[PDB]
Design a protein around this nucleic acid. Structure first.
Ligand code: K
Ligand code: K
Ligand code: K
Ligand code: K
Ligand code: K
Ligand code: K
Ligand code: K
Ligand code: MG
Ligand code: MG
Ligand code: MG
Ligand code: MG
Ligand code: MG
Ligand code: MG
Ligand code: MG
Ligand code: MG
Ligand code: MG
Ligand code: MG
Ligand code: MG
Ligand code: MG
Ligand code: MG
Ligand code: MG
Ligand code: MG
Ligand code: MG
Ligand code: MG
Ligand code: MG
Ligand code: MG
Ligand code: MG
Ligand code: MG
Ligand code: MG
Ligand code: MG
Ligand code: MG
Ligand code: MG
Ligand code: MG
Ligand code: MG
Ligand code: MG
Ligand code: MG
Ligand code: MG
Ligand code: MG
Ligand code: MG
Ligand code: MG
Ligand code: MG
Ligand code: MG
Ligand code: MG
Ligand code: MG
Ligand code: MG
Ligand code: MG
Ligand code: MG
Ligand code: MG
Ligand code: MG
Ligand code: MG
Ligand code: MG
Ligand code: MG
Ligand code: MG
Ligand code: MG
Ligand code: NA
Ligand code: NA
Ligand code: NA
Ligand code: NA
Ligand code: NA
Ligand code: NA
Lengths: 64, 146, 155, 113
RNA sequence: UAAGGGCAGACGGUGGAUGCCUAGGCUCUCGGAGGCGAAGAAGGACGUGAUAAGCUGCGAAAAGCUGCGGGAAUCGGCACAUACGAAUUGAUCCGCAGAUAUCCGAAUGGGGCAACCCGUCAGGCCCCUGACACAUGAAUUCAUGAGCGAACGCGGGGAACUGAAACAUCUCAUUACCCGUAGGAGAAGAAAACAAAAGUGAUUCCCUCAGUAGUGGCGAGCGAACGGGGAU
RNA sequence: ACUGGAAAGUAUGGCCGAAGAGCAUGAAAGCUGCGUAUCCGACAUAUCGAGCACCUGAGUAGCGCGGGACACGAUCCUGUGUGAAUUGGCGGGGCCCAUCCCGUAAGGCUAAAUACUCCCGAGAGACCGAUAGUGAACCAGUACCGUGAGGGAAAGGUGAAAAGAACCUCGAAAGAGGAGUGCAAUAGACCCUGAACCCGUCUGCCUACAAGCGGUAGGAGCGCCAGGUGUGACUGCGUGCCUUUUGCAUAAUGAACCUACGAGUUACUGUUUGUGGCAAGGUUAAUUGUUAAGACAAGGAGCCGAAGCGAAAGCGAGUCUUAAAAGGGCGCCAGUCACGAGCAGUAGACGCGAAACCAAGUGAU
RNA sequence: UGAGGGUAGGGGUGAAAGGCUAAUCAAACUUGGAGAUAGCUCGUACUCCCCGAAAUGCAUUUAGGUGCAGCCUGUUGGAU
RNA sequence: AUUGACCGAUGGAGUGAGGGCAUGGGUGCUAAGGUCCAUGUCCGAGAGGAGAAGAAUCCGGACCACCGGCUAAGGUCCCG
RNA sequence: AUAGUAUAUCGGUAGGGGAGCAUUCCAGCGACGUAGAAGGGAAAAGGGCGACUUUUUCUGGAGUUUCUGGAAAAGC
């Protein structure tokens, strides 16, 4: 049958123009005052999935 | 000529066949290694599994929302308008754009500014970028949003 | 294994018998047991692009034209089915000792019945020409009206 | 279609069983015993092709030693005198000359002694 | 030298492989049809031959009886042998319509350990034996039903192993399975409908929409509709 | 005419064909037989106007409490307790209100396009060919096993034709030797062919002072038929094989032997790649038409490519971040459809193997 | 002690041994779900040619399993 | 200088029970064919020669054939 | 393997890659067979190498097969 997309991956990742995968950063949810502003600003940015994990993320999204 | 058919070189290839002796280099363990989960019949990969450590599709948060009234425009750039007109035209329109296979029938068109539109044209599109509209009007054209 | 007529009962207890351990009677290791990875009913058809098939039709006809195995004969219709009548045309055209294909533009029921009993004779309509039937005969006999049909269709 | 290579499968066994004729007991005709014995024998033959060159050179030297000693000279001193004089006759030729043509051997000795 | 033994060959024994073959299977396509039964079924018991174990056919009219159409020299089944017969005044054989059709079995006169035992009532023969009728339940004496049997339909009930690399929500699955009950199909079906200022108008089924919108210890998983193209 | 036991074979020379499908006949038949193409046939039986406010479905719609079905852990159903209005009404458009739009619940009936095969008729197969294919080619759900529910085999072939061996010899007769039939009896009833493991007899060479996985590399003599073949005095070297292991002659695992059987397959959805078609375009799906399942022609719905950035509104070779900018992030500065192949997931998914769990029955001989 | 009845599977029966319930009992037998699951053991068949490891780190209800890295190989582009 | 030995992209893996020896160490008893690390090496996955016979000590990396020659470690009274 | 004959290289478990043989059946062009097919016994000869192939003779008494392409119930 048809391949099924993982429901959690399709709410956490996105594709870019050249094929890289967009992602958010962790450690940004609730324990915030003790962290530095530089740390929090770096964590607020979007990032890309690492090369060693692209295969697993693509399998989760059905090679998308 | 059915007695002398031949396919192109390198077009057909024999399939791999495992577990049929030592000379093939694929017998015995038949490419599976020695023991463990991966050697058994019926093993399949658990796609998100990482051995028990919290997987990447769980360590990371969800983000965003999808708008149920989103509007998307098919981008038709400036250099296409001058190319199509000269090839085939001095008044471009959606029904003409569809007739030349450049856009589907039920699709909305916005004109952008990637190129030059030197030829003087009257243009009927659903949407126009600020720079794209100025490019036509400067080149002695007309812009009709409809 | 799930299609055999034996019961799923375990034949002998797991331990203590002194021989090899055994499950049910349908095992492929047993005489009269299951057939493993045998035939299954299959559909063998696959797709070819439409433009690919048109080009292969033209290549076979080009091969015929190059090998000089194309005869154009005037359109003929029989009053009644007679196998001896159609043998005359083949013998008069000197194509009767090897597989020959007759391309006809219309039904011609009388002609079909006259050529049916002859071993190395094939009849086809000019609009249903395919690659395999062209290459399956040494000689190709086109009727003067089948040329016009082919020219408009497979251009 | 169903494909079973009965004749071909059986022909492979029959060819090898011709090679195991002359063996002791079940090693000549019982298939899994005979094939085991034949395969082990082929390993011996690869090793014994090499040892043949060792055994025949040792036999040439022993015969040359006896022939030289009848003319008051050991093998080591005779060989040292030949290599000193540039004589390139090999040990197989000299041993043959020692055994079957003793007068020619005596001329080689008389040239370096 | 050989009591004996080893190896090779020749010729045999045993055993039933292989090659060749088919009388039986397997998967389908096209068309039809989709029941049988109280006027007694499905399935059985017992019988039935010149000869007769077993199958087949048949039912005390018992390898069979009577017509009509076909057909033309053999025939009395498998199936021999022996024996006696039938048939060109048309046997056997084939198609159609009739006759006969024991006992059990829904079994239905009452019982019963299926193929058995015991009755009432009206008739006719003579301690017996023929040939009728006699269950129950739902309608109005009459009419009806019951039981059996492929799958497909619709209803009533309804698991667990398993997956979640443990497990309880969840999954397996509105599955397996049990029960009730139709038809040649059934169910659905003619808007208190969709849609979004633009429109389509009953139901059913196929291709898309789409692994999308959603749903979810937001885990494993589950998963539409609108719109468009078709069949009808 | 030849070969042959026997022509249908082969070589000549004819003929038919709307019939050159096939099966049978002493080998392989268009012209020997049954048939085939085509045409013709049934006594039976079976089937095929204005106004007006009168009406328009009640323990119903709706609601509370507890459950169920909907993709779903507003809409639909209801066990329990309640409960409207009436065309200016009532219901729906995903809490809810307003407006607007759509529609008329609490009555009913309807063909087609869809699902299936115990069965009848006609066909087919790059399906099996007797340890295969149905459990069952024969006798089969039989024999046999079980109290019962239930479980459940093995087993095909003489020959063209029984012509199935009158009669003799040895034997008490079982068995054979002959004779005869036959192309063949080493086709003689367990009968086509007739392998291996295993078992005999004969012939040739070796062997009773000799000690290890049994061979291998040398090497006389002898025996047969011109240098081939059988044997092997004597010599050198040599602790089987598989699997599992850091490491096995291992006293770790495994097998009596032979013949036969026996374990990465297929479907669908992706992805990479070899080879092709078309190319800023590529490609059809369901289905339809013609012809006779295939073949040819239609079918553009949809899908991918063609612009990105942003959570989004939205801007656009830019965009987001900023009060703005600079900086910075992401972008800008040949695809598509197939064929073959590798791999992945869903299906039992390379094979054999649990202890167990659940459902419906059978058993207190 | 004979004959005939009755109690049926989380049930029966038990002067109680977890005894007995058709040579079977800490949950009978038969058929079905069903080819349950088995991170375990055993097994995996024609040929020749080229290259050729690892038994470490991190994480893990993890420790004889697995994910990623490290180390092999095919194709392709660069020099290093 | 170096037969080319390195890297990127992308298809396919296996391995994630190691072991001996030398050197530097911890632990142990300055025990263990012990155990835990580091640096090399060999066995694993490696035949041939010497050591009487020994996985990793000494010499040495097997394309095939040869009744040719030179050497390594180690040897030259006989078995040899 | 590189360069176009020269230079280098060729021990291997897990494992990756390349190139082939046999088996059953199909399409096409064609052959063989009672003047003896398949199968079975014996012998001889071939192959860069091999999986395997060819020939002769005995048995046997009716089917068999080259090459090119295609598909698997494709090897103990
Ligand atoms: K954890
Ligand atoms: K009764
Ligand atoms: K025999
Ligand atoms: K002696
Ligand atoms: K043991
Ligand atoms: K129980
Ligand atoms: K055959
Ligand atoms: Mg927050
Ligand atoms: Mg390997
Ligand atoms: Mg092995
Ligand atoms: Mg193993
Ligand atoms: Mg391991
Ligand atoms: Mg592994
Ligand atoms: Mg398993
Ligand atoms: Mg079971
Ligand atoms: Mg079978
Ligand atoms: Mg297979
Ligand atoms: Mg024999
Ligand atoms: Mg057979
Ligand atoms: Mg009559
Ligand atoms: Mg679980
Ligand atoms: Mg009915
Ligand atoms: Mg209908
Ligand atoms: Mg709303
Ligand atoms: Mg059978
Ligand atoms: Mg014979
Ligand atoms: Mg025989
Ligand atoms: Mg002595
Ligand atoms: Mg150990
Ligand atoms: Mg290992
Ligand atoms: Mg050892
Ligand atoms: Mg021992
Ligand atoms: Mg073990
Ligand atoms: Mg054993
Ligand atoms: Mg052993
Ligand atoms: Mg064995
Ligand atoms: Mg065995
Ligand atoms: Mg106790
Ligand atoms: Mg008991
Ligand atoms: Mg239990
Ligand atoms: Mg299940
Ligand atoms: Mg199992
Ligand atoms: Mg190497
Ligand atoms: Mg473990
Ligand atoms: Mg890994
Ligand atoms: Mg580990
Ligand atoms: Mg470890
Ligand atoms: Mg140690
Ligand atoms: Mg230490
Ligand atoms: Mg240790
Ligand atoms: Mg090494
Ligand atoms: Mg080397
Ligand atoms: Mg190598
Ligand atoms: Mg096989
Ligand atoms: Na292997
Ligand atoms: Na003797
Ligand atoms: Na009567
Ligand atoms: Na800026
Ligand atoms: Na012969
Ligand atoms: Na075999």
């Amino acid at each position: 049958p048809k391949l099924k997309t993982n429901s959690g991956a399709k709410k956490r990742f996105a594709l870019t123009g050249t094929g890289k995968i967009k992602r958010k950063h962790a450690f940004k949810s609730h324990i915030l005052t003790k962290k530095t502003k530089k740390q929090k600003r770096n964590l607020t940015y979007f990032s890309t999935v690492h090369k060693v994990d692209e295969n697993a993320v693509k399998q989760l999204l059905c090679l998308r | 000529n059915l007695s002398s058919l031949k396919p192109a070189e390198g077009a057909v290839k024999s399939r791999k066949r495992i577990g049929r002796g030592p000379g093939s280099g694929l017998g015995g363990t038949s490419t599976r290694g020695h023991k463990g989960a991966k050697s058994r019949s019926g093993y399949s990969k658990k796609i998100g599994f990482e051995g028990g450590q919290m997987p990447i599709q769980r360590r990371l948060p969800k983000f965003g929302f999808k708008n149920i009234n989103r509007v998307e425009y098919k981008p038709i750039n400036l250099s296409v308008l001058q190319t199509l007109s000269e090839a085939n035209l001095t008044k471009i329109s959606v029904e003409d754009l569809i007739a030349a296979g450049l856009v589907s029938r039920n699709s909305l068109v916005k004109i952008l500014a990637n190129g030059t539109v030197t030829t003087a044209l009257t243009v009927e599109a659903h949407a126009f970028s600020k720079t794209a509209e100025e490019a036509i009007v400067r080149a002695g054209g007309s812009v009709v949003k409809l | 294994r799930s299609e055999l007529s034996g019961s799923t009962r375990k034949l002998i207890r797991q331990k203590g018998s002194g021989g090899a351990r055994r499950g049910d009677i349908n095992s492929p290791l047993l005489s009269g047991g299951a057939r493993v990875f045998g035939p299954r009913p299959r559909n063998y058809s696959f797709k070819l692009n439409k433009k690919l098939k048109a080009l292969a039709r033209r290549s076979a006809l080009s091969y015929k034209a190059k090998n000089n195995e194309i005869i154009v004969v005037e359109d003929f219709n029989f009053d009644a089915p007679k196998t001896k009548a159609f043998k005359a045309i083949s013998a008069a055209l000197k194509v009767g000792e090897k597989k020959v294909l007759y391309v006809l533009p219309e039904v011609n029921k009388n002609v079909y019945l006259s050529a049916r009993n002859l071993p190395n004779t094939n009849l086809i309509l000019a609009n249903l020409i395919n690659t395999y039937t062209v290459l399956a005969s040494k000689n190709l006999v086109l009727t003067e009206r089948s040329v016009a049909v082919v020219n408009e269709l497979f251009k | 279609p169903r494909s079973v290579n009965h004749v071909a499968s059986r022909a492979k066994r029959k060819r090898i069983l011709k090679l195991t004729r002359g063996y002791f007991g079940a090693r000549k005709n019982v298939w899994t015993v005979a094939k085991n014995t034949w395969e082990k024998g082929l390993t011996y033959a690869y090793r014994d092709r090499k040892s043949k060159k060792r055994n025949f050179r040792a036999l040439w030297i022993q015969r040359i030693n006896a022939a030289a000693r009848l003319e008051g000279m050991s093998y080591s001193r005779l060989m040292g005198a030949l290599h000193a004089n540039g004589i390139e006759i090999n040990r197989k030729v000299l041993a043959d000359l020692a055994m079957n043509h003793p007068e020619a051997f005596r001329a080689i000795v008389a040239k370096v002694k």
